[PDB]
Amino acid sequence: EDPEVLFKNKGCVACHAIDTKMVGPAYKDVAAKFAGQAGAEAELAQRIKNGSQGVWGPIPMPPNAVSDDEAQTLAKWVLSQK
Numbered sequence: 349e350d351p352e353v354l355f356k357n358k359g360c361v362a363c364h365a366i367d368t369k370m371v372g373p374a375y376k377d378v379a380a381k382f383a384g385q386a387g388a389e390a391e392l393a394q395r396i397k398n399g400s401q402g403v404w405g406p407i408p409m410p411p412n413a414v415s416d417d418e419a420q421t422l423a424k425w426v427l428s429q430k
């Protein structure tokens with residue numbers, strides 16, 4: 349599926365923007381941190397699906413209603429924002 353359509357449909361848009369921080373981090377900032385680190389895509393994909401806490405602040409990202417192929421698609425698209 350298309351990452352831009354997923355970003356809207358799966359509710360990501362409610363907590364994230366690409367350039368500014370809303371509830372979670374800006375995607376440009378995420379892409380910058382995980383730069384070109386080996387294995388980052390799989391690691392972000394897991395956090396998109398099962399949740400995250402502590403990396404960008406004290407508040408959690410709740411687990412998302414996405415499948416594994418959807419999380420990989422989204423992780424790859426977030427990293428391309430750098």
Ligand code: HEM
Pocket residue numbers: 355358359360361362363364371372373378391392395396400401402403404405406407408409410412414422423426
């Ligand atoms: C929609 C399915 C969605 C995506 C995609 C997404 C991605 C995402 C990334 C890549 C991160 C960074 C994870 C890390 O660096 O390991 C991240 C972080 C947070 N998110 Fe998110 N996110 C999506 C959806 C949502 C929703 C709906 C919310 C708000 C309820 C939300 C919130 C957060 C927060 C907060 C973080 C920070 C977690 C941290 O460790 O501090 N996300 N998200």
